[PDB]
Design a protein around this ligand. Structure first.
Ligand code: NA
Length: 129
């Protein structure tokens, strides 16, 4: 599924991501924009052999099981495939664990490089929320 900007902001809000760990909804929409361009089926292979999955490009090294990341963990207790669903529930639940892990949204390198410090409210501007 390719979400619209405001459609994804509404879905993230419904799943309690808005101001989760103090991150406003525009932060999450910005991170999803640059991680996946709002595509739930986005995948990216890392040089280390791990894979990033879904709207927030969650990595198999720590967070999900894909059977092909030697030495990895599955701290969200999900198959990485669940992160590619049209339903964002598994991505949101897992993103809550990630952002709680100590470095906040710096876990998402694209958020640090493209969202952090910017006018992230622009990402929800005009949306009925
Ligand atoms: Na894993």
């Amino acid at each position: 599924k390719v979400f619209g900007r405001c459609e994804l902001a509404a879905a993230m809000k419904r799943h309690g991501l808005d101001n989760y760990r103090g991150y406003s909804l525009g932060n999450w929409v910005c991170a999803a924009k640059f991680e996946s361009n709002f595509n739930t089926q986005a995948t990216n292979r890392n040089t280390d052999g791990s894979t990033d999955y879904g709207i927030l490009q969650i990595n198999s090294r720590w967070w999900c099981n894909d059977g092909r990341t030697p030495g990895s963990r599955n701290l969200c207790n999900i198959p990485c495939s669940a992160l590619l669903s049209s339903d964002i529930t598994a991505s949101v639940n897992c993103a809550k664990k990630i952002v709680s892990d100590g470095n906040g949204m710096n876990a998402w390198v694209a958020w640090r490089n493209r969202c952090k410090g910017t006018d992230v409210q622009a990402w929800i501007r005009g949306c009925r929320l």
